[PDB]
Write a protein that binds this DNA or RNA. Structure first.
Lengths: 284, 287, 287
DNA sequence: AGGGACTTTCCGCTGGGGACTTTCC
DNA sequence: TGGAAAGTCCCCAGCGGAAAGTCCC
């Protein structure tokens, strides 16, 4: 009965499975924000849980709560609470209740549905560390502890007064926001010059090169006044996290007799840009 | 008996009495949280501390100066609810100090003695930042923490006259910002007007890039094929001429005066202790 | 053409004159659109129709009694722009009437004849809801249509004194809701025995109005002129004695305990989440 | 202490469900 | 007119970003 307690997902001819695991990440929401929705599956759908081996005809109650991911044996995560998702499109009916300091949702597992359930009313609230730590008793730390597991459990009543209690966890779920863009960083370039017609393909080696990354060639005066800007073409295909394939643009002045020294940088999004790289254009 | 509300308005001068702020504190002062230790006492631009003094005091008795953090907002002065003075003790802490709570305002009390001219140097006073989460929860305070990060150093003293009357002088410093600035932006060099020069150095070099702050420095290096930096000289920057995109630098002299072959060295720009640009290239020429 | 601008605030008396509303209109009168027939005339809850009168007129010249529909907001009186008086004619219509138009406002005018003691039963008036889209597409307006669906019957009779001056009384009626919508949802306070009490509260108040479900709730709030609802406290609403028409509220305790000057605050009934009465008035007294 | 690294709060955008309004019976 | 149904437009869950607050290294 108590939340934190060793339980297997299967006993005798009874087995509780996560037929459909949730996504790896799921930014949780604060009480001061709206809701950020329910935990979804990679497919775009939702997780699914099921109880195999049931003979009876009386529906059961599937219990849901946010637990820990760390090594230690499963226990309610003191910094997260399942958030009950209501209507709008929610299909599984759900009841909400507290258990100690843990909120717990409970949807029905009706046999008319092979004791299968589509968890799509489960969201993830995030308590404020300060609020919890300060609690007299808790000796845990919220700081940097932002992973969880959807814990599902069903209690199977036996016509023998006995009760078989099964429990099941989802794969770990990361619940913190993750920056949309990383800072690009060019460490090496297989080209440092080339004729003004450009054309050739240059390969950059660095970090955080997403497929959206872009490359810009510029040239400015000692003043700082930019007197030339040209975006360079990238070989999306070959492009990888650590390597970049670009097509050195044509320089602005076809006919030059002196080598021209220009600049270029990779950029992710509207801000995250690496730093000025050097290149040179040689006379025809 | 000297208990007059901190919300009570008092003035800097009364008759033959005036409490001026001799040495105002710095515009900014990073305040510390309780989870942190302390981050010093407030300091004056001098590099030392702020100074308070009571002028027009003929008597020869030891008075008690009071200190606390006030609100530097569009309303009337009053104790800031998210900030408290912080008592600093020990070593270089010259002036002595006494701490005490009033309402929810921690008040510091230093001594104002005649032997020193009813003058004092503030150096046992720091600014602790209370948590927005804690304060707002208090059944009462209707104020917000969100962006309220300006404070003021209020000083007040209760003078007891023979006439039985107790004059009360109060005075608040100028505004002090209590939120650490913005960490450093990565300097970026896109161009330089010089690529080499005689080992005697001494010439001025102009760099063109972004994120250069007068608080920027330029460092020259040189390593072996192994990467062993076998040299490291800091070049002088022309603080005046320099700007966001233009950094003026004085090429430092080379280590080995007499060489026969050209030496290829490097140099980088740096903001703060960390944020530094990537190595740039430069060459010193034999005499 | 002695029509004096409708915006000019005017007392309901000027000397021994007194323009009163003998009988008051119902709390509600669903108005009709120009795509519907007419939903009839305004009536008194007594069953009959609203009654107006003028006291202090010894003369014999039967005077006219203008009538237009006005706003029922916090602001000063002003001609409502999403409502027009509808001139109703017929058999049972005892009183005659003349319909004119002052600018974008349609005005009605019946006779206030002396041979009736300067009385007048208003059984010939209706209210026409205008489409919000059309009044909001007017070059010169700034008021919102949506939700703004409360109005008041406005009267004002011109009187010529033998001294050259033209007096002018005006006496609008209670507020009237014109939408079957809110008429059925929104709760309306119409009576409150207590206007004020001391800052601690406790004192129990009785409200008499309409649409008071067991789910009703009262809420005291206070806001700065800037509209900053700073305080909001829900008063315990006696679920017992309360009835479809009466509520017993335990006046909550005011937020500031040591207040000096009376603080005026607002309170309101509210069912569900949207269904809420109109801002009521109360004033807390210091101790 | 100087500088960041992780946690909260707060701003904006968008689509389909209501809240209201206006047309019908 | 009393009762709605059809029509319109506001509003907020859900998210994605990112600035302000806290507090480690």
């Amino acid at each position: 009965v108590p939340l934190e307690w060793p339980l297997s997902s299967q006993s005798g001819s009874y087995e509780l499975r996560i037929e459909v695991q949730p996504k790896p990440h799921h930014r949780a929401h604060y009480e001061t924000e709206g809701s950020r929705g329910a935990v979804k599956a990679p497919t775009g759908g939702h997780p699914v849980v099921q109880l195999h081996g049931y003979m009876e005809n009386k529906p059961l109650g599937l219990q849901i709560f946010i637990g820990t991911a760390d090594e230690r044996i499963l226990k309610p995560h003191a910094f997260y609470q399942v958030h009950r998702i209501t209507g709008k499109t929610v299909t599984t009916t759900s009841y909400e209740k507290i258990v100690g300091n843990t909120k717990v949702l409970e949807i029905p597992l009706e046999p008319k549905n092979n004791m299968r359930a589509t968890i799509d009313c489960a969201g993830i609230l995030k308590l404020r560390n300060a609020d919890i730590e300060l609690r007299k008793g808790e000796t845990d730390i919220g700081r940097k502890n932002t992973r969880v597991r959807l814990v599902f459990r069903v209690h199977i009543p036996e016509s023998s007064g006995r009760i078989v209690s099964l429990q099941t966890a989802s794969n770990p779920i990361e619940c913190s926001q993750r920056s949309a863009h990383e800072l690009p960083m060019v460490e090496r370039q297989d080209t440092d010059s080339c004729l003004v017609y450009g054309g050739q393909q240059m390969i950059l080696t660095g970090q955080n090169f997403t497929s959206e990354s872009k490359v810009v060639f510029t040239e400015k005066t000692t003043d700082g006044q930019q007197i030339w800007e040209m975006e360079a073409t990238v070989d999306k295909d070959k492009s990888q996290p650590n390597m970049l394939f670009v097509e050195i643009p044509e320089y602005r002045n076809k006919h030059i007799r002196t080598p021209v020294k220009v600049n270029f940088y990779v950029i992710n999004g509207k801000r995250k840009r690496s730093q000025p790289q050097h290149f040179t254009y040689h006379p025809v």
